[PDB]
Structures are given as C-alpha cells and as structure tokens.
Amino acid sequence: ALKDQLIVNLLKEEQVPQNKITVVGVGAVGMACAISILMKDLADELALVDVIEDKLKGEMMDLQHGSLFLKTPKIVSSKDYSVTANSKLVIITAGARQQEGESRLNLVQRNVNIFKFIIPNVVKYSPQCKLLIVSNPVDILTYVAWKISGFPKNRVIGSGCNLDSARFRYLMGERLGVHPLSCHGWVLGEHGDSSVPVWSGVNVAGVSLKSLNPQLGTDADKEQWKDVHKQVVDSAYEVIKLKGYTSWAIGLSVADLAESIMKNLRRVHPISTMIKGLYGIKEDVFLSVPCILGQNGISDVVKVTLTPDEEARLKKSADTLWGIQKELQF
Template identity: 35%
Template sequence: MSDRPSPGPDVVVVGAGAVGATIAYTALVRGSARRVALHDIDAAKLEAEVLDISHGLSFTPRGSIVGSDDVEVCRGARVVVVTAGAKQKPGQTRMDLAGSTVALVRTLMPRLLEVAPDATYVMVTNPVDVVTTAALRLTGLPSRQLFGSGTVLDSSRLRHAISRRVGVAVQNVHAYVVGEHGDTEFPLWSSASLGGVPVRDWSRGHGGRLDEAELAEIADEVVHAAYRIIAGKGATNYAVALACCQIVESVLRDERRVLPVSTLLEGEYGVSGVCLSVPTVVGADGAVERLAVPMSDDEQHRLRLSAASIRATLEAVGD
C-alpha cells in the first residue's frame, strides 16, 4: 500500500437539504467532479442521501461520494459549495432569511477554513449576496477565492423565457441578469442578443418582435420564478444545481467561462463594499475578472439601487 495521503475531494457540498443533495447528485451525473463529499449536521439525513446517490453510481461517469457530519470530510477540498441555511418558505423573500443565515455563516466558515484553507468557496445560501459579503468580511479571503452563485440561475431563466417567446434555441440567447439575486435584480437588455442580433432589433420576420411591454413581462417572470416554484413544491433545486455545477466545472477545468457570479465590487459602476452579480470570468483561480459590460444610465442606476438593498440588509443584521 502507498503511504501517500488520499487526495481531498474535488467538491464538498455543505448542507444536505434539497439544494445541497441535488448539487452533489448533479455533479456526479454530469461528471463535474470525480470525488464528491457531502457535509451536514443531520447525520441520518446525510447517510440516506449519500446511500441513495451511491446506488446510482454504476449509471454515471466514474465517481464517488462520501458524507459525514464531521467537518474533516471537507479537508483538502478543491471547491467548497455552501448551501447550509434556513429554508425559504412560501411568501418569504430571500432577504427575510438574512439574520439566521449570517449567524450560521459566522459559525461555519472558520471551521471550514481550518480544513480547506486553499479551496475556492462558492456561496449558494440565500440571501446569497448578503451571505457572501458577510463571509468575505469574516474570513478576509479575496473575492476571487470566495464568491456567490449570484444570478447564474436567473440568467438561465431569462434565456429560457426569451427562447420560449421567439422560438430560438436557448443556447443562442445571450443575456444576463445582474444585481442582487432577488427582488431588485434586472436584465441587461442593452447588451442582450439572439444569434448576434440585439434583442431590441429582433424583428417579427425572425420569429416575433419583443417590444418593451414584453421585455418587462419577461423581467417580472424571472424575478418571481422562485416564488412560483416554492409555492408549488416547497423548494427550487434542479436548475440551481445545474447552475452551480457549471460554476464548479469552470473552476475545476479552468474553463474561464463568463458567469454572473456575486463578487465584491470595488468601485465598478459606482458600487463598492457589497457583493452583487455582474458578468465575471471564472476559472481555476476563482472569480478572476469582472467585465466592464456596457450599461445604460438606467441600468447603472438600477445596479446602485440593488447594491443599496443589499447594504441595508447587511446593516440590519449587524454586519
């Protein structure tokens, strides 16, 4: 037998709730990572989730999953995905969860850093922008190493809504949602395009014009999508898991994808001191570069309003 220590997990998912367990499952099904670990304080729930996922490993790309209520399972991880936190209930906003979740982060992050100081941390717990800002302030980690899942999912929802209306494959819709992952988020219509054609120039000859009223309807649909899903089944889990795995893959494979993750802005667009989402290059070194995306005056104003909402919640929870 070799005396070499076993490598740490490629990905640790902290929290075995609906979102965390689905991220672990999706990472194995997609082949996002070969070594996946799941950590939660609920040992019985954790054991059941790991066993259930393990029983399907013969149908997936080569991989393994382990789970433990001991934080040691996270030791040496390359990427740590944090989903632990209070569950959003029907009628609650993401910001309603802030107090209890920030308190959990204050307890959790020092323990994780002891066993995985060099990992890239992807915060998924809502309200993700508040949680990410609080975690950065607590740990002192650089924003490239610790960032939030942001509006990656929201941008996918936006592309799906546009695709459905105009009859173009969703893969050919290029559009981003920016700002808070929550009620003040908004699409960047000024840079959105379909196959290279600006959204506002899309004609009926191409399959249906999108006027300003329709764009407003799409934006409202995207903002309220999670509320609709939570009201119907209690949680969102499938699409957020896919969105998170795309972030994980970009880190582990150094894909350098442009993703609207939540990072600490430092003067860009007139915003400083809070985390929110703008298109960002994500690779092996984490969230390495925020892009200077053209924004209209109205979009820049809305981004600053979004930042103000996040800042107000941080002040309310004493962070």
C-alpha cells in the first residue's frame, strides 16, 4: 500500500476526543451554530445528528469539503446517537419553529415530545457533557431538558437572552455611535414577549444612562428608549417576516456561549437557568439572569439589583413561564 510506503506507523493507540461538540439538528439554526463553532476553532471534533438522513449527510459533506480552511480535524454525522459519544458540549437545535404571528410558547407540546426522545439518547454517550438548549420556547425547554436528563442544574443551560441582550447592545450602539462591545445593557427573563430591559444597569464606561435621563425606558422618555426593547422583542418576527427564519445572530450567540464553556472563561451571560429563591420566586422556573459560564456550565448566578418595577416585570415573566410549565406532562 501507498500509505505504508509513505508513512511508518509508530503508534496504534486509538484515542477519545478531548474537546468534542455535538450539534443536534441541521436546520438553518443548527448549521449557523456549526459553522460559527468551526470558525472559532472551539472543537477537535464536531458531530451532527438529525432524522433526515440525506440532508444530514449533505451538510456534513459540505463542511468536510472546507476542512483545508479549518482547524477541526474530524467532522462526523449520524441519525444514531453513538456518533455523539465523548462530547464536552451538546447543542440542541431540534424541533418545531414558530410561524409569523405564533408564540414560541405555542411550540411547547411538540418540542417536549421531540425532547423526550433526544435528551436520553444524548446524555447516554457523553457523561461529561453540558447541555446547551437553543430550541424554543428555550426557557421552558431548558427546564424540560433538566427534568428529562436528570442532570445537575449547572450542566443544563438555555441560550436564553444572550441574543436579546446582543440585539439590545447593537441597537443601543447604533443610537450612541459606539461599538456594541462598549454599550452595556441587560435583557433578562423570557427569550420572548415577556423579556425585561434592565434600564437601571444600561451604561457606557460605567455611566448610568438612567442617572442622566431618569425617565429612561418609561412612557415619559422624550427619546422613547422603550422602543429599543420593543425592537428587541419584535426582532425574531421582523426577520422571520423578511427572510422566513433567523439563523446568523442566534448561531453567533450560541458560539459565544460555547466559547465560554469550552475555554472555561467564566464570562457573565444572560442565559436560562433555575431562579427559584431569587426575587421571591418560589417555583422551579427557568429564565435568563446573568450567570458565570465555564467548563462545568453555570457555576454561579449574578444577583442583579432590580428596581421594584424591573423586579415586578421579571416576576411577571416568571409567572408567564410557570403557567406554561403547568402544561407539561412527563
């Protein structure tokens, strides 16, 4: 053989991948996550899983053809979950998506049914994984993935409001003529219609915008900053109306979270987690609050100081989500 005439093997020792990531679902969101992760050099192996065999194989092949231009030496795929073995991170992007004028909360029964099959199959092969839930409704589905997997809460994370806050900072950046990296502002609660803009923490270089304009984000606001949060809520629906779905911003948001987990950065992200005990919330509600994210998932929660109004709205977001949780049959 040519290979043996060219190369002498000196070590047969087959090995386990050290930094493996799995993406479940090869729809537009799943593939945006995949390409983003590959372009950030986060994994030594990427596995893709779906139920549509041809689409799955075609997606994997297309990525494989780009290997010369990447630094992820192994890209694999299968409808079989054995292909996901030894993953450090499992990203769940499977399920029904909302039509225009349909709530993400309306996806609940359909996506819980899909999760009942995916979750156990996924956890089985990767004892060291963190579960990163992207599928909607993300908050409810992070709670669902937590209850089905039986994982500790630190290991089960929802992409939640990382994208909402990225949109909030883009929009604030645009109004102020400043890069989003230097515009700070938090959108917490549901990754949906009940999200909460934390006006009290909106700042540039530590300067509170609300200290400058105390009416910031109210109906009394001369510059109607509330319209920025309105634009954040309406973002998915405006883009869906235009191109039929969304994929790039979410793929980059998910890759941002994968980077913190894979590199143990311990950076703070507004992501879906269990908030029972915080803000007088006594139920097992999952929703976005600032979390410290690293190699063991969420190791810590940032206790944001909310004004009674921001706190009322966060509790309103938690009540909405709890009501929806009351519909779950396991």
